[PDB]
Design a protein around this ligand. Structure first.
Ligand SMILES: OC[C@H]1O[C@@H](O[C@H]2[C@H](O)[C@@H](O)[C@H](O[C@H]3[C@H](O)[C@@H](O)[C@H](O[C@H]4[C@H](O)[C@@H](O)[C@H](O[C@H]5[C@H](O)[C@@H](O)[C@H](O)O[C@@H]5CO)O[C@@H]4CO)O[C@@H]3CO)O[C@@H]2CO)[C@H](O)[C@@H](O)[C@@H]1O
Ligand code: NA
Length: 399
């Protein structure tokens, strides 16, 4: 009370949470207070000083919530699957307060329809289609998103992981929403957060770029992009341009770090996501790709010693002697269709592996960072070889 003539010593005490002891932040990132199943309830029981002169309030994702017990300092709450922000705010009668903030992880059951974020598919755009990846999602007849009931979910069979395709309503404004999966029976299951944005948001592929060659960037509303500026060099002509992807020619820049910005058609600034931080400026590392060798050279360790196609030599030691530690070697390889199997390995002249033997079925690019130890061993062991069977070396580059 305030009208009180005076406050007892115990009333004016600082608030302390004695038990339980909560973990400290990981490294700015919040710690986990609870890790329970969707069928179990969030159960935390506080002991607090002063005994009879403290009130505690609970917040799930910033929203105040009743403690499901007669006591106000024990919470009992049934939560849907997901990860939740929990705040524990303790206040005394004379207004002094202490605080705890942590995560509550609620795991689904095996048979539950469930979904987590794999890559960046939880960033969605109003009017457009989006994907959920998870388990048992063929059960879902509706998704609930910020008051809207999305009733057109389609479970797509894929060569990779299957997904639940759904359309975001146009009416939904920007922000973060906690989605819920609904059965035909009516049962509801948690599927964590979705982020709705109208912004042209570049998400991945924009950290690194090779000068004077194709550069593919992945985002959400990238068709609205009118131009990108790297260094001081503006690019307004693109090879591909869709919602999810844009490809351009990285301009002729010296090796180093550069600022990238962009402009939409409306004139607003292109946004960039890096570690769940959104900026209007992106740091791009540019490097030039040097060609060391070009052609079409078959490799088979079946062929006899002395045969030019038993290995890939053809890049002399003095070239590798010049390469600086940290550089990325790339070997572009293609299969021989008539070959029974396809295995390759990068090695020294002594056939010491610089990395694992790899088995493959399709054409590709093998990249490997050459450390100072690797470079030293190459000089010590008679140079560089590509070894294996049933493939061709078509290009070798370094940057
Ligand atoms: O055949 C099918 C089968 O192939 C398997 O792969 C085999 C491959 O078939 C073999 O040809 C290959 O043999 C290489 C040896 O593994 C490798 O150690 C050896 O390297 C020699 C090098 O030839 C030689 O010049 C070097 O001499 C140096 C001295 O050691 C130094 O003291 C001196 O100062 O300088 C000289 C340099 O001139 O010694 C090294 C070894 O120490 O080269 C062989 C080929 O010539 O082995 C492969 C297995 O690793 C494949 O695994 C199967 O799957 C496949 O069915
Ligand atoms: Na799955």
């Amino acid at each position: 009370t305030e009208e009180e003539p005076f406050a007892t010593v115990t009333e004016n005490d600082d608030p302390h949470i004695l038990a339980p002891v909560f973990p400290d932040r990981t490294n700015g990132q919040l710690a986990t207070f609870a890790n329970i199943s969707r069928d179990a309830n969030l159960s935390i029981a506080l002991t607090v000083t002063p005994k009879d002169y403290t009130t505690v309030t609970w917040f799930i994702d910033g929203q105040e919530v009743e403690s499901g017990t007669d006591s106000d300092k024990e919470i009992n709450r049934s939560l849907k699957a997901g990860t939740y922000n929990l705040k524990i705010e303790v206040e005394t009668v004379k207004g002094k307060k202490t605080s705890r903030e942590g995560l509550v992880v609620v795991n689904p059951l095996a048979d539950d329809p469930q979904s987590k974020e794999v890559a960046f598919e939880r960033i969605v755009s109003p009017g457009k289609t989006a994907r959920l990846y998870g388990s048992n999602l063929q059960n879902v007849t509706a998704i609930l998103l910020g008051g809207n009931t999305i009733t057109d979910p389609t479970y797509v069979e894929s060569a990779d992981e299957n997904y639940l395709e759904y359309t975001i309503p146009t009416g939904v404004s920007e922000g973060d929403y906690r989605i819920v999966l609904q059965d035909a029976d009516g049962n509801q299951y948690g599927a964590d957060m979705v982020k709705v944005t109208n912004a042209s948001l570049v998400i991945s592929g924009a950290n690194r770029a090779t000068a004077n060659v194709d550069w593919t960037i992945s985002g959400i509303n990238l068709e609205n992009i009118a131009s990108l500026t790297i260094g001081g060099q503006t690019v307004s002509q693109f090879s591909n341009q869709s919602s999810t992807e844009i490809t351009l020619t990285c301009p002729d820049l010296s090796d180093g770090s550069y600022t990238m910005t962009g402009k939409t058609r409306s004139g607003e600034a292109v946004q960039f996501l890096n570690d769940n931080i959104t900026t209007t400026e992106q740091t791009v590392t540019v490097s030039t790709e040097i060609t060391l060798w070009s052609g079409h050279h078959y490799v088979s360790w079946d062929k006899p010693d002395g045969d030019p196609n038993k290995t890939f030599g053809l890049i002399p030691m003095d070239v590798f002697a010049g390469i600086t530690a940290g550089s990325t070697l790339k070997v572009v390889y293609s299969i021989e269709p008539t070959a029974e199997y396809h295995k390759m390995q990068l090695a020294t002249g002594y056939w010491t592996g610089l990395a694992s033997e790899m088995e493959f079925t399709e054409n590709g690019e093998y990249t490997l960072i050459l450390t100072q130890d690797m470079l030293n061993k190459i000089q010590a062991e008679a140079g560089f070889l590509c070894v294996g069977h049933g493939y061709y070396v078509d290009l070798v580059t370094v940057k």
